[PDB]
Amino acid sequence: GSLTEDGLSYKEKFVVRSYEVGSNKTATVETIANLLQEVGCNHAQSVGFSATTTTMRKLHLIWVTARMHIEIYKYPAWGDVVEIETWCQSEGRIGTRRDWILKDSVTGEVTGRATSKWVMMNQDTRRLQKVSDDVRDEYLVFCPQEPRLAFPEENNRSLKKIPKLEDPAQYSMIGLKPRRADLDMNQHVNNVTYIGWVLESIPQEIVDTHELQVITLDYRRECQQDDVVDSLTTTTSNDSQFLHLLRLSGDGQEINRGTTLWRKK
Amino acid sequence: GSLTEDGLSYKEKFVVRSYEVGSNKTATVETIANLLQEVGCNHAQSVGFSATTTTMRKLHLIWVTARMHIEIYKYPAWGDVVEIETWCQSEGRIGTRRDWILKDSVTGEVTGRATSKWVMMNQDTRRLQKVSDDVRDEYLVFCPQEPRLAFPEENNRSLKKIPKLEDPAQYSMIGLKPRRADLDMNQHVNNVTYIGWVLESIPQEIVDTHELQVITLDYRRECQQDDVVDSLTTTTSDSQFLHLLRLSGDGQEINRGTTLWRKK
Ligand SMILES: NC(=O)[C@@H](O)C1CCOCC1
Ligand SMILES: NC(=O)[C@@H](O)C1CCOCC1
């Protein structure tokens, strides 16, 4: 991969692997989400990060994902080349945003797009905070100055408020636990794992007859390595919509909430 | 990737990804095993196998992994380029073997090696059988004629008999279940997932102070999408462990194995 000519965005190509595809012989949404995470990581490395700056490290500060929104029009097939372009943007003192555009390498057509909201937090106390001016200036030299949005629309799905699923849930998948493959290099549960856990409570019949078009996921609390999770889903709706909830198996402490939109195959 | 000049083996390079590494910032054994599986699929595609032959499809026959043995000397770091060479071999009517050699792209040094034993079976009845004769012919044109072994030493770790772990196990991880990411394109549990489940019963302290050097795994029965598994481990000793994967209810055996670990 490489930064574009202006140095304000980063591009990388990926060839879809055999174990990365589902029953349709096309990449899963978890494969897509892992690839977005990989291109984001390579973008940070290319401009001297890690995404902590020198000031953030001095104050034990980290960037944390608050929301992830993905819309896929076409899943790349096994063996296809997918090109992803990503960039970051400052959102004042609220936090930062990372956007992605997915394209078919052969045709150049947009096959998907994603946006994520990030908030600043003390690594030890877990206390969120607004962005300091010294930090804001340090990453503004790597972001475009004029707004560049993957989701520019007037009232788009990426910014919609998500409600809390009420008991009883229509569907559920109980006793989900992360294994070592679900942990990143810092022994924290990978953000993509939660996408998988949310989808576990979608019945196999929807999965077999529909394609996932949109997923919006809020991250409220982290699942520890020794925590057990319950995945809850209720139909809110040819299209099918669902409301999701991930909560701890015991006390019922909320860890995630989301919505998915599916279309008939 | 591409087949070598003689067309009897296949090579592919891979750049290690951020989510593919563990605490040591080096690729996990599950990442390694996924890469071997990927180079194996690309080798089959390149010689027209889509690993069923023409006669196997009409007869409802498939190749199934019976044993997987992996020995790693150095795990590639995040960002490194690893080159893997793989080839197949006929083992008479017992079955077939697929071997791999892992190398550092920059130095050309061997950083690991793997071998797998495969058996033939009817995909419906799940009944094993001796390969054939008219099927051996179709495979032998894509394999080297003289023996080429990733593990050539006479009576080596890859061919050792594995015993059954006796209850009570020293360590255990119970209630393991596969999710959709653990399934392949045919809705079967990926063979690499069982490697992960075996390692789940190794205490975090061994993982934090040792590096996995060798793993040998026997595949006895498949875990269905709706099955629950218990992972059992006992120290037999470097550190060595004996492993058992069995169904959470009846205790039906699905895998057995051994791992050897070195102090970091
Ligand atoms: N590192 C990242 O960009 C993560 O926060 C994302 C990656 C895509 O899946 C959702 C979480
Ligand atoms: N397809 C294959 O080569 C599999 O049978 C292997 C892959 C890596 O180790 C576990 C089993």
Side-chain angles (χ1 to χ4, degrees):
Chain A
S2 173
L3 290 164
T4 54
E5 199 84 316
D6 67 2
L8 297 176
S9 75
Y10 188 97
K11 282 178 184 165
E12 193 176 349
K13 292 193 199 89
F14 304 94
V15 169
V16 175
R17 304 183 172 168
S18 55
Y19 59 71
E20 284 176 341
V21 306
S23 40
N24 305 117
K25 271 166 209 45
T26 63
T28 58
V29 79
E30 290 185 78
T31 286
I32 302 302
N34 268 331
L35 294 185
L36 305 178
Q37 159 174 264
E38 174 70 7
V39 75
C41 185
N42 291 340
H43 180 202
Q45 267 200 219
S46 72
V47 293
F49 284 127
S50 169
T52 71
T53 83
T54 68
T55 305
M56 293 176 68
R57 279 178 247 118
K58 171 220 180 295
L59 301 174
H60 275 73
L61 291 176
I62 53 174
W63 282 115
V64 24
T65 298
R67 175 176 281 198
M68 178 67 178
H69 176 83
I70 305 171
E71 172 162 28
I72 302 293
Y73 316 119
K74 247 170 186 167
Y75 286 92
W78 162 28
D80 288 357
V81 179
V82 48
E83 184 169 59
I84 306 177
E85 179 185 18
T86 189
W87 69 93
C88 293
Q89 202 138 72
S90 182
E91 301 211 308
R93 282 182 112 106
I94 309 178
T96 61
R97 198 187 78 250
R98 174 174 288 272
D99 289 6
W100 297 258
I101 307 294
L102 286 95
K103 277 183 186 174
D104 177 353
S105 249
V106 184
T107 71
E109 87 185 15
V110 175
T111 56
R113 47 182 185 144
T115 180
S116 63
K117 300 283 215 225
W118 300 71
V119 298
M120 189 112 85
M121 204 190 69
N122 181 278
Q123 192 165 20
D124 301 319
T125 72
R126 253 69 230 285
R127 294 180 68 77
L128 302 161
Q129 57 191 62
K130 297 274 104 175
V131 184
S132 87
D133 290 14
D134 284 319
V135 167
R136 215 182 64 232
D137 303 343
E138 282 171 26
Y139 65 72
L140 268 173
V141 305
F142 307 111
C143 303
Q145 310 295 91
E146 305 180 13
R148 194 192 168 181
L149 298 152
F151 293 88
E153 298 84 41
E154 232 61 40
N155 270 153
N156 55 92
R157 311 166 148 155
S158 76
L159 311 175
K160 202 181 172 182
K161 197 68 170 289
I162 305 166
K164 204 182 188 175
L165 185 148
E166 290 182 11
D167 274 7
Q170 186 181 15
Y171 306 114
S172 80
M173 170 60 68
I174 293 329
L176 297 169
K177 322 187 299 197
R179 55 186 179 89
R180 291 194 195 104
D182 297 305
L183 310 178
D184 62 21
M185 63 189 90
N186 312 123
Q187 297 188 256
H188 289 285
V189 175
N190 190 305
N191 293 321
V192 176
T193 296
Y194 305 90
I195 295 175
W197 285 338
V198 158
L199 302 168
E200 263 319 273
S201 52
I202 294 263
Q204 193 64 52
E205 312 96 274
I206 291 299
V207 175
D208 293 343
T209 61
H210 292 71
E211 279 238 292
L212 181 63
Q213 297 209 286
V214 191
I215 178 166
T216 306
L217 191 57
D218 278 344
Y219 290 79
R220 195 193 202 78
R221 185 172 303 272
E222 193 156 356
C223 169
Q224 252 84 253
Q225 186 179 174
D226 62 344
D227 278 339
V228 181
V229 160
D230 287 359
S231 183
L232 306 148
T233 293
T234 296
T235 314
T236 56
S237 42
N238 276 358
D239 285 6
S240 294
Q241 306 210 29
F242 298 94
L243 187 57
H244 300 284
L245 186 72
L246 292 194
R247 67 178 184 209
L248 290 184
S249 170
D251 56 0
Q253 174 89 83
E254 180 184 344
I255 66 159
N256 289 83
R257 72 171 70 177
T259 57
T260 55
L261 175 76
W262 302 68
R263 118 170 289 109
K264 219 178 76 171
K265 286 168 176 193
Chain B
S2 175
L3 291 163
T4 54
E5 197 86 312
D6 67 2
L8 297 176
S9 75
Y10 188 96
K11 282 177 184 164
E12 193 176 348
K13 292 192 198 91
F14 304 94
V15 169
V16 176
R17 305 182 171 168
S18 55
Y19 58 76
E20 284 176 341
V21 306
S23 315
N24 25 54
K25 271 166 211 47
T26 63
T28 57
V29 79
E30 290 184 78
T31 286
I32 302 302
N34 268 330
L35 294 185
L36 304 177
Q37 158 174 264
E38 175 69 7
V39 74
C41 280
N42 292 339
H43 181 203
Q45 210 269 344
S46 71
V47 293
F49 279 94
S50 182
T52 72
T53 85
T54 306
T55 44
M56 291 171 71
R57 296 181 225 270
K58 58 166 106 290
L59 257 37
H60 269 57
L61 265 15
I62 51 161
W63 282 113
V64 150
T65 298
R67 169 108 119 202
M68 178 68 178
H69 177 83
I70 304 172
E71 291 195 12
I72 303 293
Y73 316 118
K74 248 169 187 172
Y75 286 92
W78 162 28
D80 288 357
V81 179
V82 48
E83 184 169 58
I84 306 176
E85 179 185 19
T86 189
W87 69 93
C88 293
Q89 202 138 72
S90 179
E91 301 211 308
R93 16 232 307 145
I94 308 296
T96 216
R97 197 187 78 250
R98 174 174 288 273
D99 289 6
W100 297 258
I101 306 294
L102 285 96
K103 277 182 186 173
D104 178 353
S105 250
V106 185
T107 71
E109 87 185 18
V110 176
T111 56
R113 45 178 189 163
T115 180
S116 64
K117 301 282 216 223
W118 299 72
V119 299
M120 276 257 247
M121 76 159 61
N122 185 284
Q123 53 175 233
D124 306 314
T125 73
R126 308 200 234 256
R127 291 180 67 77
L128 271 99
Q129 65 191 60
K130 312 309 290 174
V131 300
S132 185
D133 246 51
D134 29 21
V135 167
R136 289 204 293 115
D137 302 344
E138 305 188 45
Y139 246 57
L140 286 161
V141 303
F142 307 112
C143 303
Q145 309 296 298
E146 305 193 346
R148 194 193 169 181
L149 298 153
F151 293 89
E153 314 91 357
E154 206 163 345
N155 266 330
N156 52 270
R157 311 166 151 154
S158 75
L159 312 173
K160 202 182 173 183
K161 195 71 173 61
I162 305 166
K164 204 181 188 177
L165 185 148
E166 293 179 24
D167 275 6
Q170 185 181 16
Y171 306 114
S172 78
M173 169 59 69
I174 77 176
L176 297 168
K177 321 188 298 197
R179 56 186 180 87
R180 289 190 195 105
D182 297 306
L183 310 178
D184 62 21
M185 62 190 84
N186 312 123
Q187 296 187 249
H188 290 284
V189 175
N190 190 305
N191 293 320
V192 177
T193 297
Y194 304 90
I195 295 175
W197 285 337
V198 158
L199 302 168
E200 263 318 274
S201 51
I202 294 263
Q204 194 62 52
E205 35 265 75
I206 291 299
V207 175
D208 293 343
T209 62
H210 292 71
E211 279 241 302
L212 181 63
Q213 166 112 38
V214 189
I215 178 165
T216 306
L217 191 58
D218 278 344
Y219 290 79
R220 195 193 202 79
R221 185 171 304 272
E222 278 199 26
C223 168
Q224 314 288 109
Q225 186 179 173
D226 62 343
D227 278 339
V228 182
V229 161
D230 287 359
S231 184
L232 306 148
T233 293
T234 296
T235 314
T236 55
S237 42
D238 284 5
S239 294
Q240 305 210 29
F241 298 95
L242 187 57
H243 301 283
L244 186 73
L245 292 194
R246 67 178 185 209
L247 291 184
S248 172
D250 56 0
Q252 175 88 261
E253 180 183 344
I254 66 159
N255 289 83
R256 72 171 70 176
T258 57
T259 55
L260 175 76
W261 302 68
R262 62 206 194 247
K263 217 176 81 160
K264 285 169 176 192

